[PDB]
Amino acid sequence: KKWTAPFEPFQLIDNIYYVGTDGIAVYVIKTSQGLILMDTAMPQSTGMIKDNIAKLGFKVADIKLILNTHAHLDHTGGFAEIKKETGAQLVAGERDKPLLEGGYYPGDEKNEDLAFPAVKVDRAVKEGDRVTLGDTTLTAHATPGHSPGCTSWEMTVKDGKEDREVLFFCSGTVALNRLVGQPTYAGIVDDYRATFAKAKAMKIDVLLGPHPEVYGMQAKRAEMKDGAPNPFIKPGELVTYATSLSEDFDKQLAKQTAALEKK
Ligand SMILES: NS(=O)(=O)c1ccc([N+](=O)[O-])cc1
Ligand SMILES: [Zn+2]
Ligand SMILES: [Zn+2]
Numbered sequence: 098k099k100w101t102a103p104f105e106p107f108q109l110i111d112n113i114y115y116v117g118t119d120g121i122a123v124y125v126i127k128t129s130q131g132l133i134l135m136d137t138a139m140p141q142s143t144g145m146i147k148d149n150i151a152k153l154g155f156k157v158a159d160i161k162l163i164l165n166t167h168a169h170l171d172h173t174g175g176f177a178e179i180k181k182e183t184g185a186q187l188v189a190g191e192r193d194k195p196l197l198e199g200g201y202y203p204g205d206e207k208n209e210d211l212a213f214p215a216v217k218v219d220r221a222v223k224e225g226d227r228v229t230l231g232d233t234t235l236t237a238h239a240t241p242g243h244s245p246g247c248t249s250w251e252m253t254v255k256d257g258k259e260d261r262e263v264l265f266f267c268s269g270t271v272a273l274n275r276l277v278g279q280p281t282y283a284g285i286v287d288d289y290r291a292t293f294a295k296a297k298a299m300k301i302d303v304l305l306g307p308h309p310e311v312y313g314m315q316a317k318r319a320e321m322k323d324g325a326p327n328p329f330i331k332p333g334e335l336v337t338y339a340t341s342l343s344e345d346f347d348k349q350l351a352k353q354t355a356a357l358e359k360k
């Protein structure tokens with residue numbers, strides 16, 4: 098369904114371009130010294146992603162860096178292919194390196210339906226690390242929980258004369274993760290808690306993420322018009338979204354906890 102369904106690519110704000118599917122967000126960041134690719138999609142969708150890149154007039158061969166938000170197959174599925182064909186370097190949060198290099202789902206390592214083609218991490222990042230290509234720098238923020246190395250990426254764009262701060266938020270959903278009993282990884286609950294709080298304290302103009310549902314992409318795209326305000330600028334949104342995530346987290350934690358009582 099949605100994850101592999103097409104969506105027309107577009108310039109989102111300044112040098113950030115959407116090239117994902119209807120259900121998985123992928124971005125090209127255009128720099129003075131080549132392209133940065135933010136994530137990929139499912140392993141079967143790599144051709145579609147490359148075609149979307151070409152539809153905007155970009156060359157896949159110009160990709161120099163590939164950045165990851167988090168190491169699940171729906172975001173990493175094209176990494177091994179694109180890295181091999183371009184010679185790009187892969188940059189990811191240090192604690193997701195084992196996931197990326199093994200091509201497995203943490204705490205469910207034998208589940209082949211969650212596997213992806215293994216890929217080596219060239220640069221393992223930590224909180225505050227700066228990744229520069231030409232005129233463009235992204236800053237890594239450690240926002241674990243959804244994965245142990247989940248990295249939210251900060252960058253500055255222009256809106257007319259003014260700076261606006263973008264966060265590629267890495268994801269904060271519970272989704273398939275086990276929080277209790279046999280947790281997906283050690284300290285997962287504390288990580289989620291810390292991440293919700295951290296997200297609410299950041300000063301972010303433009304919320305993005307690895308699924309369009311993170312930021313209501315489709316509705317904003319519909320509102321775009323030459324000379325009208327860029328609808329992706331909503332500075333309160335990360336607070337609102339993190340609050341919704343935290344509230345769902347509480348529900349999932351309670352559900353999973355109750356489920357430990359064997360009947
Ligand atoms: N990123 S996620 O947590 O929304 C997610 C990734 C993969 C699957 N999957 O393959 O079933 C489910 C959920
Ligand atoms: Zn088209
Ligand atoms: Zn995920």
Ligand SMILES: [Zn+2]
Pocket residue numbers: 169171172307308
């Ligand atoms: Zn996902």
Ligand SMILES: [Zn+2]
Pocket residue numbers: 143147178179182
């Ligand atoms: Zn290819």
Ligand SMILES: [Zn+2]
Pocket residue numbers: 224225237238239
């Ligand atoms: Zn930070």
Ligand SMILES: [Zn+2]
Pocket residue numbers: 272273274275
């Ligand atoms: Zn579950």
